[PDB]
Amino acid sequence: KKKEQLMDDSFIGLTGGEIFHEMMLRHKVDTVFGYAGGAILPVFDAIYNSDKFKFVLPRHEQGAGHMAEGYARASGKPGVVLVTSGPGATNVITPMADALMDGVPLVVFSGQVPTTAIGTDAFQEADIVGISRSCTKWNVMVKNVAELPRRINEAFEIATTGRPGPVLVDLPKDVTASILRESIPINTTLPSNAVSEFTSEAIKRAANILNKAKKPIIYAGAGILNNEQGPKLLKELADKANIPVTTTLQGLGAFDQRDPKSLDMLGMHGSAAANTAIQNADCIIALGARFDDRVTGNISKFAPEAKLAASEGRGGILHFEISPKNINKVVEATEAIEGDVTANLQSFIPLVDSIENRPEWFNKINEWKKKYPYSYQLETPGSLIKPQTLIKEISDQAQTYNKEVIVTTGVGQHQMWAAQHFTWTQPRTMITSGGLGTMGYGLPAAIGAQVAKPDAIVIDIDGDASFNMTLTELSSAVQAGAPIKVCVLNNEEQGMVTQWQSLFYEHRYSHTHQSNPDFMKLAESMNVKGIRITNQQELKSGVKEFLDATEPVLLEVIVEKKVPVLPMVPAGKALDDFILWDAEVEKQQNDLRKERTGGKY
Amino acid sequence: KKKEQLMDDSFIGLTGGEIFHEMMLRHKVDTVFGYAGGAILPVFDAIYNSDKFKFVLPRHEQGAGHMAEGYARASGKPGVVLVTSGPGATNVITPMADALMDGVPLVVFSGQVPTTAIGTDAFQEADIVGISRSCTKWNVMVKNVAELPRRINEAFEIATTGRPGPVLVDLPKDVTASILRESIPINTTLPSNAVSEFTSEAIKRAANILNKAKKPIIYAGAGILNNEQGPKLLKELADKANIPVTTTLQGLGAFDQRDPKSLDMLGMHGSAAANTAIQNADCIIALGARFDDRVTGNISKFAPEAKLAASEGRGGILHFEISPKNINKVVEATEAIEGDVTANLQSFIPLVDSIENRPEWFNKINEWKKKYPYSYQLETPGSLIKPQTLIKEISDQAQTYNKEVIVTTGVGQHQMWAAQHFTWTQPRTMITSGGLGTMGYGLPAAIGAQVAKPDAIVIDIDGDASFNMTLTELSSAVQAGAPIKVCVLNNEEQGMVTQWQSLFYEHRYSHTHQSNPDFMKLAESMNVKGIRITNQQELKSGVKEFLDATEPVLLEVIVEKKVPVLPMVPAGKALDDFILWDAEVEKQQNDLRKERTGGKY
Amino acid sequence: FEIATTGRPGPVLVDLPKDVTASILRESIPINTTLPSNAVSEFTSEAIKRAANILNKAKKPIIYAGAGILNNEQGPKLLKELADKANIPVTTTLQGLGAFDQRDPKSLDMLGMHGSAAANTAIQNADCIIALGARFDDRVTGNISKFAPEAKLAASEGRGGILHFEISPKNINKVVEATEAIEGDVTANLQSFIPLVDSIENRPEWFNKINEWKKKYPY
Numbered sequence A, B: 001k002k003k004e005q006l007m008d009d010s011f012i013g014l015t016g017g018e019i020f021h022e023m024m025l026r027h028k029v030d031t032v033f034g035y036a037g038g039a040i041l042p043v044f045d046a047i048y049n050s051d052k053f054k055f056v057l058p059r060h061e062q063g064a065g066h067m068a069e070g071y072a073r074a075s076g077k078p079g080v081v082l083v084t085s086g087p088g089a090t091n092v093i094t095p096m097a098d099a100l101m102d103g104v105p106l107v108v109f110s111g112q113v114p115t116t117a118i119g120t121d122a123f124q125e126a127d128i129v130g131i132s133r134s135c136t137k138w139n140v141m142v143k144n145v146a147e148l149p150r151r152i153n154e155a156f157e158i159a160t161t162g163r164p165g166p167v168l169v170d171l172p173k174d175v176t177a178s179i180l181r182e183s184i185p186i187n188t189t190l191p192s193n194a195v196s197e198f199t200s201e202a203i204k205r206a207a208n209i210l211n212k213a214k215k216p217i218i219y220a221g222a223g224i225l226n227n228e229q230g231p232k233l234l235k236e237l238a239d240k241a242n243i244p245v246t247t248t249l250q251g252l253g254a255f256d257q258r259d260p261k262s263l264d265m266l267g268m269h270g271s272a273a274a275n276t277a278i279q280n281a282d283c284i285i286a287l288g289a290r291f292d293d294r295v296t297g298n299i300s301k302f303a304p305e306a307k308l309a310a311s312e313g314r315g316g317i318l319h320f321e322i323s324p325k326n327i328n329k330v331v332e333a334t335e336a337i338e339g340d341v342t343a344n345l346q347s348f349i350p351l352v353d354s355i356e357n358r359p360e361w362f363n364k365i366n367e368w369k370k371k372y373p374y375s376y377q378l379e380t381p382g383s384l385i386k387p388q389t390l391i392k393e394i395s396d397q398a399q400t401y402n403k404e405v406i407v408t409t410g411v412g413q414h415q416m417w418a419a420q421h422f423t424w425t426q427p428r429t430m431i432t433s434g435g436l437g438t439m440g441y442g443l444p445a446a447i448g449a450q451v452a453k454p455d456a457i458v459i460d461i462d463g464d465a466s467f468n469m470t471l472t473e474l475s476s477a478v479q480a481g482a483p484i485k486v487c488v489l490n491n492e493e494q495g496m497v498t499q500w501q502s503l504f505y506e507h508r509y510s511h512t513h514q515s516n517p518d519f520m521k522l523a524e525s526m527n528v529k530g531i532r533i534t535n536q537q538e539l540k541s542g543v544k545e546f547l548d549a550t551e552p553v554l555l556e557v558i559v560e561k562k563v564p565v566l567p568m569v570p571a572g573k574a575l576d577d578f579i580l581w582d583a584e585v586e587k588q589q590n591d592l593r594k595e596r597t598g599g600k601y
Numbered sequence C: 001f002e003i004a005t006t007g008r009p010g011p012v013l014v015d016l017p018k019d020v021t022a023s024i025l026r027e028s029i030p031i032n033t034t035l036p037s038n039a040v041s042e043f044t045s046e047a048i049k050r051a052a053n054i055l056n057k058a059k060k061p062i063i064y065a066g067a068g069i070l071n072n073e074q075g076p077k078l079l080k081e082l083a084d085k086a087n088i089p090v091t092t093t094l095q096g097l098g099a100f101d102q103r104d105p106k107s108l109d110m111l112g113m114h115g116s117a118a119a120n121t122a123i124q125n126a127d128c129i130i131a132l133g134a135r136f137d138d139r140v141t142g143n144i145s146k147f148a149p150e151a152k153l154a155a156s157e158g159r160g161g162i163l164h165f166e167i168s169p170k171n172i173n174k175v176v177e178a179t180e181a182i183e184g185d186v187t188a189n190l191q192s193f194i195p196l197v198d199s200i201e202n203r204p205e206w207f208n209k210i211n212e213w214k215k216k217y218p219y
């Protein structure tokens, strides 16, 4: 009688495909991104005309992958991908690697050739379990239909726990076509569903360290976004102990940048005020951030004041991190607090002393913010639109709609300028490829985010070269009914690469100018509204038309070429050893570039 | 003095990037396909404005990969790819897997993060050596500049010997930026530069078997194309011993299909005459073909007459194969002849008896060819153009120019119809993704083939869904000056998948209808000539304008929807258990489809 | 434990970090994880019927039995029942030794590199080979292209061949092509096989050869 209670017969008679369908329902999947093919056909037949979730069809499986990423980052739910064997599966490798580097919960289901054909170099056979091993948290090949529910449960659990990340489940055609003939453990048919004394002591110790600090700073990242209460507790800590807050690129929106305590973004292209502050802080509170090499600058020269404080027992680095692999990986933590940062903050904050004022510290911070704004060369009569100005215009106008605003980007200068010049205020509103840094990410990510948030304004701030990578997915946006807003910053160059070529290779631009299509005729061919802004006098009204649109829309803006992103901490330099914008220096750079290229650039 | 003669000092003082450049020259590389990025910048600076080879810039690294494949298959030279780390490298995974499955010599050079940053989850770091291990013959990461020339030599050698295939060489940024300070063995600075008694005896034994055969057949594949004399010796053998010849998809063009001895293509969608002949042959001469599962049909039921003949010592299977892994992998060879098929044919043919006539065998063969043409439902008044007719029109008109004609394809029905209805006569004129079967292959492969053969007519016969995958590379064709000819068979469906859904899933079309852009406005946006054929009366003049064009051109043809590719040997059936076209059956299928879909399809 | 003991049995390894085994369980776990464990496909059933019809035609059958028959207590019993019913000589591998009573007149002893020349001669001349839980290892088959000529001829003429009872798909058609492959536990499949096999009283010609070979090929 007990055995009957622990076994389940309800799936008997169903195909593997039909069992897949049922398990999607039980895992509350409301959206699937995918593309059909021979090996995955039994699953596609099972989900035929399903009213249980929305299916989104891209033009390319890489599109499906990045869409699912955008969906996951906007919603906080795992992004589900369904593709066929061989090239269908190998086409998702870049999105999987992308999701691993940025901690994105992705569940990839790939069709596979029949088990009778595996290992024979069969039609459309790829060793995707072998290939994807390094770009997934975990993967598996299902070998019989009886274990399919269990493997699906395991995939979703692994993808969404610890540091979230991609998993892949390989589905042989004869398994998904086969019918379950036996009962299975009832726990495998259902999804899911205290603090260690060691961590509790670490938290108490961390509190005592912070209570001594005279120059504290919070360094917050993507981890704080993986709980709804995250930003709330971050604000509570900063308010109680009176601490300035800087964030990573992936942490943007975790803290209200309108708050006086906001130091904006830190790192290679972050605020020099933020970079100066972290180099001078005696206590660094790292909340869900991994000390990436775009953030720390030269590692041996990173955070000198905090390391000194640690040695003198009056400060140091307090690292709230969920993955042991990323604790003491780059920098030694004075105290490591393992687990979910939000949960641990609940225990941390009541032990932290309330502080009214920090006159000396905040005097320095206010002085640094004043002398280190995001300065750049403004428009002049007759000049092209400056890309920094464009971003500001979009940020100002977008904030006046009574809708949430979500931003995705491509990779390059436009991405950095978007990060710098938007005013970030809400969690999960910056959706950008940071770790892997995949060009082409912007458009499909926007589609995925728009599907997750149908009532949001979703803006893809894209580069012309990045947009070229995946522009076929415009048709996908129309077919999905996703009214995304794409803004292409057209500088007719791979700007981020030409910046480095100008700086380190004496203006030798080696293969960094790709030809662009006519973006207005392209938009027309894709059945998308097109807007082109070519001069300063069209900027305001053009951006308004862009944002007022109630349909998918592509905005092209002609912007100044050969303009560097500043500030910049060059590779190998300390975080406070930065290059700042200077008008006279820019003019000299222009003359030098003109001379060296014979007036071509 | 001897040591001075064996060491070389000539590269001392050069950066790794400059050494790469020199080694490309020494390997007679005339074309490089690639895309820049941070990790590979030292190499791009070294090849800046090089007049030693043509550089081709795609819009996407997958484009570079498939272009290099098309280049390699058209030219017989290795296709060289140059990309950056991370997403640049992961984007080449599908082309590498593609090249492995189809035996294409591909040399991929990928930038990598500095050695000081490897294994730290660095900016744009992917474990590409781990990821690409299953989709390359061999890969390596260069760890110091002194070993760079040797690794480049090894890569080219491995890629082009045995069964050709892809290799990857990983290039850390600090290695390519570093300068060679020491002498290296002089053999590493230069590229390169008898039959075993066992094989010789096998050849003699194989000859004696063929000299007994009463119903011989040649089964020829891609391997015969890997030597310039290949097709010549194939013809010499067939003529001398009077043997009918069938080829694989990848073998198309190895034998002049106008020859009476031609049995056309065999396999799942091959001629029923070819399939019948191989099932009844007492001796099968396999020349550079791997008995793939799209060719053999049900393996246990494959070649019954040849297996009987082997057991009775009067025939069997004679396998000329260069890779031991593919000998006795699928079917047992009666005699295995290891090595280059063309070289071994030179030893084989003089031992083979000359034969004047085979009255009985060729009477059967001629009868089979007569009753098994590639039949289909012809146009009727007012109907759309039939896709089979379109292919015939292009084949007939293309053959009247005084230029070589090279065909690339996408993947699906159009691919099979192209294979069936073109008349193949010349080697290396069918460039198609067969093993992996990658949609999106057609356009970039055409660009690569066109660059390899600037005086050739290059036609991409593409599907609408396949073309959507990589249509951004149209801009790439213009920028490269490659006057490719793209013909999109627009049936507004994933036809190959709907064929299987009609056949096995009762006309349940699950997510197999993607929306298409306006292909004429698309062509215009890409600065490409556009032609649209919508009815029967525009077919001839439209195809002529297509072929007469001296610029990149996109032709869209509206063709009949929901038409199956026939003949068809269903998966699991014997090669001679095929479905044939029948007019009445097609009509009944149409009525059934109409009823089941409520008149929607 | 499940993986080690199912399919073809084999080794598994479980790695146990010191701090895991020293740590204390503080949370409830699914009750199924706290307990160990605890029909024939139509495809296999048809293969079995087909295999029976092939054996019922055979004039020179031989059983080639290996370690697989030992992985069920009823294994040797069913092997003997089959051999007795259809009157078939039995040879075994090194790992199959003890599966068949070698005192039985139908015993051909061990085959292979150092096996009986009587067993080796018999398998090279048999028109039907019944492989029971054996993997055609290279110490057993001799030269693969020259292995079992009479059984391959019989298969081509539709009057015999190789009938392979094997639990692991990886070892089916790995070395030699099976005329019929019967997937699953050999003992369980024999229960379905034997009632379809015709009872045979004598094989005068075949057993005359076998007895002659045993006489001239002692150890």
Ligand SMILES: Cc1cc2nc3c(=O)[nH]c(=O)nc-3n(C[C@H](O)[C@H](O)[C@H](O)COP(=O)(O)OP(=O)(O)OC[C@H]3O[C@@H](n4cnc5c(N)ncnc54)[C@H](O)[C@@H]3O)c2cc1C
Residues within 6 Å of the ligand: A101, A102, A103, A162, A163, A164, A220, A221, A222, A223, A224, A226, A227, A247, A248, A249, A250, A251, A265, A266, A267, A268, A269, A270, A287, A288, A289, A290, A291, A292, A294, A295, A320, A321, A322, A323, A326, A339, A340, A341, A342, A411, A412, A415, A416, A433, A434, A435, A436, A437, A496, B123
């Ligand atoms: C062109 C370019 C320029 C760039 N320049 C910059 C720059 O100037 N500044 C900058 O900041 N970035 C920059 N980057 C991005 C950079 O590379 C990284 O992607 C980014 O800094 C990572 O931020 P993160 O640590 O907050 O997020 P992640 O990489 O996702 O790390 C989050 C950390 O928090 C942990 N974590 C996750 N969930 C939890 C939880 N629930 N509880 C506790 N811990 C958790 C994770 O395990 C991980 O260790 C740039 C990228 C590009 C493409």
Ligand SMILES: Cc1cc2nc3c(=O)[nH]c(=O)nc-3n(C[C@H](O)[C@H](O)[C@H](O)COP(=O)(O)OP(=O)(O)OC[C@H]3O[C@@H](n4cnc5c(N)ncnc54)[C@H](O)[C@@H]3O)c2cc1C
Residues within 6 Å of the ligand: A123, B101, B102, B103, B162, B163, B164, B220, B221, B222, B223, B224, B226, B227, B247, B248, B249, B250, B251, B265, B266, B267, B268, B269, B270, B287, B288, B289, B290, B291, B292, B294, B295, B320, B321, B322, B323, B326, B339, B340, B341, B342, B411, B412, B415, B416, B433, B434, B435, B436, B437, B496
């Ligand atoms: C939708 C679709 C349908 C298809 N249907 C068919 C079909 O009906 N018919 C068909 O034929 N194909 C079909 N295919 C293609 C099929 O999958 C294989 O790609 C193709 O049959 C392989 O042909 P091949 O053996 O000649 O080439 P390869 O796969 O390249 O094999 C060549 C063999 O020759 C060997 N070799 C290479 N060089 C030499 C040398 N110098 N000397 C000796 N040996 C050498 C190689 O090692 C290899 O074993 C289809 C593909 C698709 C996408």
Ligand SMILES: Cc1cc2nc3c(=O)[nH]c(=O)nc-3n(C[C@H](O)[C@H](O)[C@H](O)COP(=O)(O)OP(=O)(O)OC[C@H]3O[C@@H](n4cnc5c(N)ncnc54)[C@H](O)[C@@H]3O)c2cc1C
Residues within 6 Å of the ligand: C007, C008, C009, C065, C066, C067, C068, C069, C071, C072, C092, C093, C094, C095, C096, C110, C111, C112, C113, C114, C115, C132, C133, C134, C135, C136, C137, C139, C140, C165, C166, C167, C168, C171, C184, C185, C186, C187
């Ligand atoms: C010096 C030396 C000399 C040797 N010479 C010989 C020789 O002359 N003759 C000889 O026979 N061996 C010889 N061997 C041993 C030989 O190498 C192999 O180990 C042996 O032949 C394997 O026998 P086997 O196939 O029965 O067992 P296994 O290797 O264990 O194969 C058993 C097969 O049955 C399958 N199976 C397992 N369980 C089941 C089940 N429940 N139902 C169905 N199928 C199942 C397995 O998957 C496997 O395919 C020699 C070894 C040495 C060291």
Ligand SMILES: COc1cnc(OC)n2nc(NS(=O)(=O)c3c(OCC(F)F)cccc3C(F)(F)F)nc12
Residues within 6 Å of the ligand: A037, A038, A039, A040, A041, A085, A112, A113, A114, A117, A122, A123, A124, A125, A173, B268, B293, B294, B496, B497, B498, B500, B571, B572
């Ligand atoms: C050209 O072959 C196919 C074309 N289009 C297809 O669906 C749209 N399929 N679907 C299959 N399935 S298959 O034939 O059993 C098969 C396959 O068949 C093995 C044998 F049963 F023929 C081997 C490897 C892969 C596949 C795959 F992935 F395609 F399913 N083959 C094709």
Ligand SMILES: COc1cnc(OC)n2nc(NS(=O)(=O)c3c(OCC(F)F)cccc3C(F)(F)F)nc12
Residues within 6 Å of the ligand: A268, A293, A294, A496, A497, A498, A500, A571, A572, B037, B038, B039, B040, B041, B085, B112, B113, B114, B117, B122, B123, B124, B125, B173
């Ligand atoms: C945002 O960082 C870059 C943007 N654009 C670039 O070139 C177009 N590069 N180039 C680099 N080189 S890097 O800084 O030494 C570096 C890197 O730096 C390590 C340390 F020296 F900072 C770590 C991992 C990869 C790279 C890579 F691949 F980008 F070279 N970084 C960027």
Ligand SMILES: C/C(NCc1cnc(C)nc1N)=C(/S)CCOP(=O)([O-])OP(=O)([O-])O
Residues within 6 Å of the ligand: A410, A411, A412, A413, A414, A415, A437, A438, A439, A440, A462, A463, A464, A465, A466, A467, A489, A491, A493, A494, A495, A496, A497, B035, B036, B037, B038, B061, B084, B087, B088, B091
């Ligand atoms: C080539 C390159 N980076 C290397 C590279 C190569 N390939 C891929 C898939 N991704 C990346 N990041 C950049 S950042 C160029 C970006 O050009 P852009 O899209 O027009 O943006 P912008 O000009 O504003 O810098």
Ligand SMILES: C/C(NCc1cnc(C)nc1N)=C(/S)CCOP(=O)([O-])OP(=O)([O-])O
Residues within 6 Å of the ligand: A035, A036, A037, A038, A061, A084, A087, A088, A091, B410, B411, B412, B413, B414, B415, B437, B438, B439, B440, B462, B463, B464, B465, B466, B467, B489, B491, B493, B494, B495, B496, B497
């Ligand atoms: C989806 C699919 N195959 C599965 C698939 C999925 N994804 C990739 C990258 N490649 C393949 N082969 C086909 S063949 C559809 C082909 O549609 P088509 O390009 O319009 O050609 P056609 O309609 O003539 O069959």
Ligand SMILES: [K+]
Residues within 6 Å of the ligand: A257, A264, A419, A420, A421, A422, A423, A424
């Ligand atoms: K800001």
Ligand SMILES: [K+]
Residues within 6 Å of the ligand: B257, B264, B419, B420, B421, B422, B423, B424
């Ligand atoms: K033809």
Ligand SMILES: [Mg+2]
Residues within 6 Å of the ligand: A463, A464, A465, A489, A490, A491, A492, A493, A494, A495
């Ligand atoms: Mg740009």
Ligand SMILES: [Mg+2]
Residues within 6 Å of the ligand: B463, B464, B465, B489, B490, B491, B492, B493, B494, B495
């Ligand atoms: Mg189509």
